[PDB]
């Protein structure tokens, strides 16, 4: 448990490592040659009288760990944190455990990044990947073909500027993802033609009657394919931008067409994020062994306003309760004079809402002028009301490149109030004694008994894309369709659940259930082995822990 530091004269960084009770300095060590060329060049021979021997309880309050090229369920992240309780670290070390490997990065104490340091049981570690699975939804409207200030198309700003910057940073940080690039848009008055009927939809408003025919189109570009040397997608997206208006206007039904409706008036935005969730719920089907993190990024030329039905917004709140994966970025620029992600309700004062689950970021272009105006203008020829959006102050939002190049996995420890009484009128305890055997047959008995993998509670999966007509535009996919029915259910009325799973020797796991947060408490295979495995299997699906 002894800690040894060793600079030389006026090394502005330092170095330190561990041993067990060094006092007389008879014994030294060589274990690493790399750290010389990793920090500072000198050849320290046996005793130059600079090696400080000190306890020096100095912690490293947040440490980041990056993964590459593998697949790690969050129980293995829990095993790495359990093995990383009481050790030391430095920048760019390759931490290993049981064929699992991570690279250390950006280790901070409270304002400043440290070259080295010590980790003991109360600092927090956060896991990030450079090998994630990422979807890019480009929303198209009639504002793509509209100019802005500085002189550009918003499409050209978005694709050229932002995607060139993102792919250069993907080359620089040496990451390797699996992408989709999906274009999506709407048209109005595409009522009917020869057998194009289950493709349309029909929008309406209750309080003032308004009902129109509309139609949603998705055109995908490269579906599930990793490759280095990007920017060829930029050429294909330019080809599809020029081919796009005929490709969307003159298809399946031909009434009088109105293409690519405005984002600040209509939009298929919330349905697009809900369909990304409809992809990500079935992650356990065909499992790549080369990806860990999950990411869905929507690029919009919108302002931040969306006119959205009530049921879809409440449903996607209840579905991002499970697996938070959604990121929004705006290549329109022009950060408006209000709380910028906002929803005007479209329910079957104009009822506002502001989300705090979404991660929005703007993209300013690269030029320097005098007074960047925050307004458009177009000349025509001729009881509560408790959220308004205007008294919320908002200076500037960046791009947050670090949450777009290295995606962050979901945390481990969150603090929340206990399971008292009142609403959650249901607890159930199962105390399962375990007989060790030397003949694989012991975990699954407790497993199929005590949960049946949320056999109690439901999975709120109410969106089902049942139909999709496709179109014979070319050899990628091209589904152009209607979303189908949305069979929403409310949450569990007048009762949540909580559970008490006991090991009859000395052990308890107290499960809460609104999001699966746990409290583990202690008092052939061993007892602690089965206990740790069961906590890992409750950890795999929804795995928050209470702490203190």
């Amino acid at each position: 448990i002894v800690e040894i530091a060793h600079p030389n004269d006026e090394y502005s960084p330092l170095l330190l490592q561990v041993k067990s009770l060094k006092e007389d300095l008879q014994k030294e060590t060589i274990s690493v040659d790399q750290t010389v060329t990793q920090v500072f060049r000198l050849r320290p021979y046996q005793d130059v009288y600079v090696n400080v021997v000190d306890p020096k309880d100095v912690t490293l309050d947040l440490v980041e760990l990056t993964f590459k090229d593998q697949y790690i369920g969050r129980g293995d992240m829990w095993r790495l944190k359990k093995s990383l309780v009481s050790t030391c670290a430095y920048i760019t070390q390759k931490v290993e455990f049981a064929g699992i490997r991570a690279q250390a990065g950006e280790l901070w104490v409270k304002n400043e990044k440290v070259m080295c340091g010590y980790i003991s049981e109360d600092t927090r570690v956060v896991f990030r990947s450079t090998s994630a699975m990422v979807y890019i939804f480009i929303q198209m409207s009639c504002e793509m073909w509209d100019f802005d200030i500085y002189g550009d198309l918003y499409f050209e700003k978005a694709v050229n500027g932002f995607l060139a910057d993102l792919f250069t940073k993907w080359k620089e940080k040496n990451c390797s993802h699996e992408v989709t690039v999906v274009l999506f848009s709407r048209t109005f008055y595409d009522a009917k033609s020869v057998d194009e009927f289950p493709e349309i939809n029909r929008a309406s408003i209750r309080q003032d009657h308004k009902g129109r025919f509309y139609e949603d189109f998705y055109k995908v570009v490269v579906q599930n394919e990793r490759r280095e040397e990007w920017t060829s997608l930029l050429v294909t997206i330019k080809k599809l931008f020029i081919q796009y208006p005929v490709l969307v206007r003159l298809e399946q039904a031909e009434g009088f067409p109105q293409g690519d409706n405005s984002t600040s008036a209509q939009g298929n935005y919330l349905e697009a994020i809900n369909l990304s969730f409809n992809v990500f719920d079935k992650h356990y089907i065909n499992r790549n062994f080369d990806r860990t993190g999950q990411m869905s990024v929507v690029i919009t030329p919108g302002v931040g306003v969306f006119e959205v039905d009530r049921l879809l917004m409440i449903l996607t709140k209840q579905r991002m309760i499970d697996n938070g994966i959604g990121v929004d970025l705006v290549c329109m620029g022009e950060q408006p004079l209000h709380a910028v992600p906002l929803f005007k309700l479209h329910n079957r004062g104009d009822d506002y809402n502001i989300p705090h689950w979404i991660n929005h970021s703007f993209y300013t272009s690269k030029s320097q002028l005098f007074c960047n105006s925050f307004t458009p203008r177009i000349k025509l020829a001729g009881t509560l009301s408790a959220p308004p959006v205007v008294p919320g102050f908002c200076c500037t939002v960046g791009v947050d490149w670090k949450s777009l190049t290295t995606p962050a996995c979901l945390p481990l420890t969150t603090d929340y109030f206990p399971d008292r009484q009142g609403l959650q009128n249901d607890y159930t305890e199962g105390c399962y004694d375990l007989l060790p055997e030397a003949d694989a047959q012991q975990v699954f008995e407790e497993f199929i008994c005590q949960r049946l993998m949320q056999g109690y509670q439901i999975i709120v999966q109410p969106k089902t894309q049942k139909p999709n007509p496709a179109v014979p535009p070319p050899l990628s996919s091209s589904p152009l369709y209607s979303r189908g029915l949305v069979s929403r259910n409310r949450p569990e009325e007048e009762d949540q659940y909580w559970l008490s799973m006991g090991r009859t020797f000395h052990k308890v796991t107290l499960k809460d259930k609104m999001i699966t947060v746990t409290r583990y408490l202690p008092k052939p295979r061993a007892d602690e082995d089965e206990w740790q495995l069961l906590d890992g299997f409750v950890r795999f699906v929804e795995g928050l822990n209470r702490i203190r």
Binding site: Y427, T428, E429, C431, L434, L435, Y456
Partner: protein, 300 residues
């Protein structure tokens, strides 16, 4: 203690509504009759292992009682559920009205346990008699006795009465345990030798963690049936009270006018109490006779 670790099997079934999993949850998790209002709905099947004075361990199955779950018991995977069953407990509500469907399920369950268990046994248990007046309690229990003795014709059953707010529950599961126990005659002989050479009023020996009446011997037969039930209920109430004090019990002494009762640990999971037919003796007799008893039971 010779640890012949067998593995017994016991099912608990009946209709939903009244007292299916509540009684199990108050007899193996240290609850009260008031806090069992919060268990609520179970699911299809949930089971547990409970260890019990060492060697014996119970696979205690708790089966639900909806229509689809009973149908998915009978006309489905039945051969897996009703195989290697030793003890069945079948729960009867009093207040429930659909008696025809209850006895229909009972007939189907008897025929299924006959065609999947030759030497198991069925205890049917009419609980929740806390709502009916006592003369009508006698009438209803005798009618259940005679009607269930008729309809349980090709194989016998044992029908007991109980409620949650009293101690007949502890008597009924004391009976279940004493039937389910492996050994009888050696413990009876040590019981009888101890009681007849240290001249006690009555001696009583119990499991520690749940305190069900394992064995007893008396020579003053003036307490009818309700002594065991009452003393078990009140000292387990006292253990529940001491549970919130982070401390174990393991030892107590009381004496009175014509009364001398003592409680202590005997073995790894056994309590003893005794009343000693000579109230004017201090703890020297309890000392020399816990010596006299732990020389023998720690040869067992």
């Amino acid at each position: 203690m010779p640890n012949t670790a067998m593995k017994k099997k016991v099912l608990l079934m009946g209709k939903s509504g009244s007292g299916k999993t509540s009684m199990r949850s108050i007899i193996f998790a240290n609850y009260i009759a008031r806090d069992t209002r919060r268990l609520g709905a179970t699911i299809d099947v949930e089971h547990s292992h409970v260890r019990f004075l060492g060697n014996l361990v119970l696979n205690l199955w708790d089966c639900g009682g909806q229509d689809t779950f009973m149908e998915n018991y009978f006309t489905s995977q039945r051969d897996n559920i009703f195989r290697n069953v030793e003890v069945l407990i079948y729960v009867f509500d009093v207040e429930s009205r659909e008696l025809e469907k209850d006895m229909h399920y009972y007939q189907s369950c008897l025929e299924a346990i006959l065609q999947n268990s030759p030497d198991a046994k069925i205890f049917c248990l009419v609980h929740k008699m806390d709502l009916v007046q006592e003369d009508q309690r006698d009438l209803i229990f005798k009618e259940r006795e005679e009607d269930l003795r008729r309809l349980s014709r090709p194989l016998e059953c044992a029908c007991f009465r109980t409620s949650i707010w009293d101690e007949t529950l502890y008597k009924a599961w004391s009976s279940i345990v004493y039937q389910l126990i492996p050994n009888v005659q050696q413990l009876e002989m040590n019981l009888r030798n101890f009681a007849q050479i240290i001249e006690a009023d009555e001696v009583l020996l119990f499991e520690r963690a749940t305190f069900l009446v394992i064995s007893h011997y008396q020579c003053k037969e003036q307490r009818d049936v309700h002594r065991f039930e009452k003393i078990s209920n009140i000292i387990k109430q006292f253990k529940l009270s001491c549970s919130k004090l982070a401390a174990s019990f393991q030892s107590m002494e009381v004496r009175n006018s014509n009364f001398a009762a003592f409680i202590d640990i005997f073995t790894s999971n056994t309590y003893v109490m005794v009343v000693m037919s000579d109230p004017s003796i201090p703890s020297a007799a309890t000392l020399i006779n816990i010596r006299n008893a732990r020389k023998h039971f720690e040869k067992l």
